[PDB]
Design a protein around this ligand. Structure first.
Ligand SMILES: Nc1ncnc2c1ncn2[C@@H]1O[C@H](COP(=O)(O)OP(=O)(O)OP(=O)(O)O)[C@@H](O)[C@H]1O
Ligand SMILES: Nc1ncnc2c1ncn2[C@@H]1O[C@H](COP(=O)(O)OP(=O)(O)OP(=O)(O)O)[C@@H](O)[C@H]1O
Ligand SMILES: [Mg+2]
Ligand SMILES: [Mg+2]
Lengths: 385, 51, 49, 50, 426
């Protein structure tokens, strides 16, 4: 009771003050200036018409022009002029054009696009510094590769080695490979990119290779970063369709991904994470070792590892005096970490079933037998016996 | 009907609706719709005679 | 004068749904969403689907 | 205002300048129109007893 | 339930306050774009924006006509073509004469084709096939030529001249490397011997092999040794190909090498772009087929090549045209393959050389334990061993630190078949 009040003491006053502070300041900003900056703004608005057609800058020719490719079907030789500089632009950046006669009138985007919006996230990570136990060892391998160059680059220099680039998490479902990456990201306090690899692909053609570029482009602006491209399996060796409407799309999109990962330089400052079911849903060579270090094979919790996962859950639920910690383990045979969480959800539903406010002995025992029954084989001991 | 939840019901695999966008991205929009109009039950179909 | 407007040429679209009781949103066979004023002297009970 | 328009707000526009009208919370997609087709859920557990 | 219940609602209001706080924040951002040196750009800025002088559409020539002999008047003429230089100057039964030539037919990037005239800045020697040309917003006519394609500036990046790679940065003094020397250096020094024998001197080579061997390192190695300038194109890094854009990618760099003497044209990774066509496939492409048709003819044309050598690296020889695999394009074929024990000793010695480690290590000792492998895997053993070494807090990775690193890659191999052997006691 006393400490949840202390969270309230810290959060209510500081946070409530912060809203109020923003709200007055929006007025207050205006008042210091009354000419010069106001004037320049005023003529920016006369110059720039309403609406503005979006552009994408392909390239700058150094003579006060450029070439843009726009969602308007023909391309344009546009000029660079009015409240924009030649060096305020870089190629491949998104520009704002004048409706009447296309001209770069400045930038207020700088790689602002919807695919950027999905990718950047302001969400809170689900796990923070391995909240849920088990897989102690595997995290002390992600950390060596990913977290460790960011935190201390010096140690690699004494060693005289180049620092790693990226990790590949793979193997079993229900082992929380996608959640360890979230843990590592919160530990450092890095920039995290939840983009999903499957969100670049659509029926419509020719859109995809833009999207692959934009990932590497944004990641480098906000570096240091951790990039997670989750579920790069779907864009693997496989094909969209066996008829039509996708013969090209997977082929261009994957190839284009390998290229801009290597083309950065061999960096140890923008890490990638590829989350994949297996290497049998991807191409047999990726990009392909010395360059992609390290590879982490997830396999099923062992008796030690699954104990650890379980102890977390059971303590957050009523009672444990009824059926010993050991007696849960003993009854269970080795399975993924989802099966361990599943037994506890079912146990809780069973306490509801009885209409108890205690997880009784009976509830534990049934919940254990249920999961084992899904998920079953018996010809391991049938070949034998 | 009794829970006082949304319905939809999604019949089969999604590609079929294209009237605006494509059916690949209506899966992405499954989130946006489910949440705003929560409380929802979604009866997602796919019999799997695909096999 | 209204009746002239009602006769051909017309472009097919498909009514989706209302947003008001006198304005609706359609999408055409052109492939463009247009928010349209609905004409008086038509269904608005059997127009909704 | 730009304090009255939010991120991910659907809006109406003209077509001769695309000048805004007003805010709309009705978001129009084929999936949302699928709910219009389906209509209301029906029946009761004792109709489907056994 | 007062201890948690009351405190639950209090938790909730704070979160909602925080959501509201973020929408207040993002509606105002940082002012504006106004910069004092580009406020002076505004003086010129009003005049050009209101004038009819931009934008110019990007078009590009796709078809050349000669503007007499075209068949523009069709009165007393016949066919689709005339005399190929006259059509209205030999007859006035058309009732017209015109003296316009090299009119040219452009394509827009909307895929709409138009014939246009020529400006006051244009003459037929400023225009060509494949060259960007700017045309009006309304009624079209060429104003200013723009340089050919989107290739310039993007190609130059890929080209590095005079590599900082020799046969010290390649391990093994492999069989392929000995046949590689014969192709570049030997007919460059002395084209006399080849002439007298009555063989036509090797100048084509295709380096191919599994990934991770270092087919490229060698190719760079000899480029420096022969002391020739190096021109590189990578046809899976450079993916411009659209309607014979990649034929312009090929042409420039080949054309540049040809103006110089003592050169290497290295065409790399041509599995795509100038590679296999996908008409047969479901891809329907024959955009990479223009790149192919150009590449062949550039070679064939260059011949005798004056001791300027055309090299090829491609991963697979399955992605090549059988016209390349006729002699006079490719003459020598080298498959790169797994290095021997000492060859794998050498790739380990270079990796280890960069490291700051204890010197008491012996390179042969480590590579024994190692199986037959790719160079890229031996890069991995040193980088992995580096990570184990800092973790244990040694500033050196001992011989023992590299044996742990070797073992983990192998253990994976065991996981995919079956573990445990008879070599735990033999
Ligand atoms: N080391 C760990 N970190 C995080 N959670 C873990 C750990 N070990 C086990 N778990 C357990 O595994 C459960 C399942 O995780 P989750 O279902 O997200 O799996 P995944 O391997 O990322 O899957 P998918 O293939 O479905 O994308 C967690 O909820 C937790 O109970
Ligand atoms: N001969 C070698 N000497 C030293 N290291 C080597 C050698 N061969 C390969 N390696 C290592 O492997 C890394 C990557 O492979 P490399 O670029 O040499 O190969 P490739 O088979 O020509 O490749 P790709 O399929 O990427 O074109 C090198 O940067 C280097 O560290
Ligand atoms: Mg996952
Ligand atoms: Mg190579």
């Amino acid at each position: 009771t006393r400490c949840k009040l202390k969270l309230l003491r810290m959060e209510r006053i500081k946070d409530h003050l912060l809203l109020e502070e923003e709200f007055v300041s929006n007025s207050e900003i205006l008042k210091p200036f009354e000419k010069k900056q106001e004037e320049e703004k005023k003529q920016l608005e006369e110059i720039r018409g309403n609406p503005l057609s979006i552009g994408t800058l392909e390239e700058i020719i150094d003579d006060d022009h450029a070439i843009v490719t726009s969602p308007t079907m023909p391309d344009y030789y546009v000029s660079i002029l009015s409240f924009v500089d030649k060096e305020l632009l870089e190629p491949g950046c998104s520009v704002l054009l004048h409706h009447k006669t296309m001209s770069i009138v400045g930038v207020l985007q700088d790689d602002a696009d919807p695919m950027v919006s999905v990718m950047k996230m302001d969400k809170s990570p689900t796990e923070s510094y391995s909240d849920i136990g088990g897989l102690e060892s595997q995290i002390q391998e992600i950390k060596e590769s990913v977290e460790l160059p960011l935190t201390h680059p010096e140690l690699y220099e004494e060693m005289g080695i180049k620092p790693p680039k990226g990790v590949i998490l793979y193997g079993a479902p229900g082992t929380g490979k996608t959640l360890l990456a979230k843990a590592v990201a919160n530990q450092t306090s890095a920039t995290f990119l939840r983009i999903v690899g499957s969100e670049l692909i659509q029926k419509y053609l020719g859109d995809g290779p833009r999207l692959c570029r934009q990932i590497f482009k944004v990641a480098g602006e906000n570096a240091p970063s951790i990039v997670f491209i989750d579920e790069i399996d779907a864009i693997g060796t496989k094909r969209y369709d066996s008829n039509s409407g996708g013969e090209r799309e997977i082929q261009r999109t994957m190839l284009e991904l390998l290229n801009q990962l290597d083309g950065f330089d061999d960096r140890g400052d923008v890490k990638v994470i590829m989350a994949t079911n297996k290497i049998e849903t991807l191409d047999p060579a990726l990009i392909r070792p010395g360059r992609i270090d390290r590879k982490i094979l997830f396999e099923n919790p062992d008796l030690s590892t699954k104990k650890k996962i379980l102890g977390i859950h059971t303590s957050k639920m009523n009672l444990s005096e009824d059926v010993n910690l050991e007696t849960l383990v003993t009854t269970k045979d080795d399975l993924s970490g989802a099966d361990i969480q599943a037994m506890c959800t079912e146990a809780g539903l069973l306490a509801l079933r009885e209409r108890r406010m205690q997880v009784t002995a009976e509830d534990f025992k049934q919940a254990k037998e249920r999961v084992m029954k899904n998920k079953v084989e018996e010809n391991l001991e049938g070949l034998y016996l | 009907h009794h829970t006082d939840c949304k319905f939809i019901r999604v019949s089969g695999a999604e590609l079929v609706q294209k009237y605006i966008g494509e059916g690949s991205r209506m899966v992405r929009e499954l989130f946006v719709m489910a949440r705003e109009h929560a409380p929802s039950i979604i009866f997602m179909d796919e019999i799997d005679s695909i096999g | 004068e209204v009746k002239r407007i009602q006769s051909v040429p017309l472009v097919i679209g498909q009514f989706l749904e209302p947003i008001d009781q006198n304005t609706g949103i359609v999408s055409s066979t052109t492939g463009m969403s247009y928010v349209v004023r609905i004409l008086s002297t038509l269904d608005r009970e059997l127009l909704k689907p | 205002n730009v304090k009255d328009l939010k991120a991910s707000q659907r809006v109406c526009l003209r077509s001769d300048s695309y000048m805004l009208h007003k805010v709309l919370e009705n978001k129009a997609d084929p999936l949302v129109s699928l709910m219009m087709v389906e209509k209301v859920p029906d029946s009761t557990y004792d109709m489907v007893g056994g | 339930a007062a201890p948690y219940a009351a405190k639950l609602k209090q938790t909730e209001n704070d979160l909602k306050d925080i959501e509201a706080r973020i929408k207040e924040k993002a509606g105002v951002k940082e002012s504006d774009t106004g910069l004092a040196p580009s406020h002076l750009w505004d003086i010129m800025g009003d005049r050009q924006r209101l004038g009819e002088e931009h934008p110019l559409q990007v078009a590009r020539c796709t078809k050349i006509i000669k503007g007499n002999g075209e068949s523009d008047e069709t009165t007393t003429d016949n066919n689709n073509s005339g005399n190929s230089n006259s059509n209205s100057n030999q007859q006035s039964t058309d009732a017209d004469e015109d003296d316009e030539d090299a009119k040219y037919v452009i394509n827009l990037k909307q895929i709409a084709k138009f014939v246009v005239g020529l400006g006051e800045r244009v003459s037929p020697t400023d225009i060509e096939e494949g060259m960007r040309v700017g045309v009006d917003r309304s009624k079209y006519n060429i104003e200013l030529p723009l340089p050919p394609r989107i290739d310039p500036s993007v190609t130059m990046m890929t080209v590095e001249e005079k590599p900082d790679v020799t046969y010290s940065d390649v391990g093994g003094c492999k069989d392929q490397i000995e046949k590689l020397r014969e192709v570049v250096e030997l007919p460059l020094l002395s084209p006399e011997r080849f002439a007298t024998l009555g063989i036509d001197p090797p100048k084509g080579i295709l380096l191919y092999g599994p990934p991770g061997t270092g087919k490229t390192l060698c190719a760079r190695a000899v480029a420096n040794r022969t002391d020739a300038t190096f021109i590189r194109v990578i046809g899976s890094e450079l993916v411009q190909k659209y309607v014979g854009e990649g034929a312009r990618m090929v042409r420039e760099l080949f054309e540049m090498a040809r103006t110089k003497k003592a050169c290497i044209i290295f065409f790399d990774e041509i599995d795509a772009v100038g590679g296999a066509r996908f008409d047969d496939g479901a891809g329907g492409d024959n955009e990479v087929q223009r790149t192919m048709l150009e590449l062949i003819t550039q070679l064939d044309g260059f011949d005798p090549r004056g001791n300027i050598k055309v090299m090829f690296a491609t991963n697979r020889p399955n992605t090549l045209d059988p016209a390349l695999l006729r002699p006079g394009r490719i003459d020598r074929k080298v498959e790169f393959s797994l290095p021997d024990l000492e060859g794998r000793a050498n790739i380990f010695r270079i990796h280890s050389k960069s490291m700051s480690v204890e010197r008491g290590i012996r390179w042969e000792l480590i590579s024994r334990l190692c199986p037959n492998s790719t160079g890229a895997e031996l890069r991995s053993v040193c980088t992995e061993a580096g990570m184990f070494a800092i973790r244990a807090r040694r500033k050196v990775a001992t011989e023992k630190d590299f044996l742990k690193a070797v073992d983990k890659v192998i253990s994976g191999y065991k996981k995919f078949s079956s573990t445990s052997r008879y070599m735990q006691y033999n």
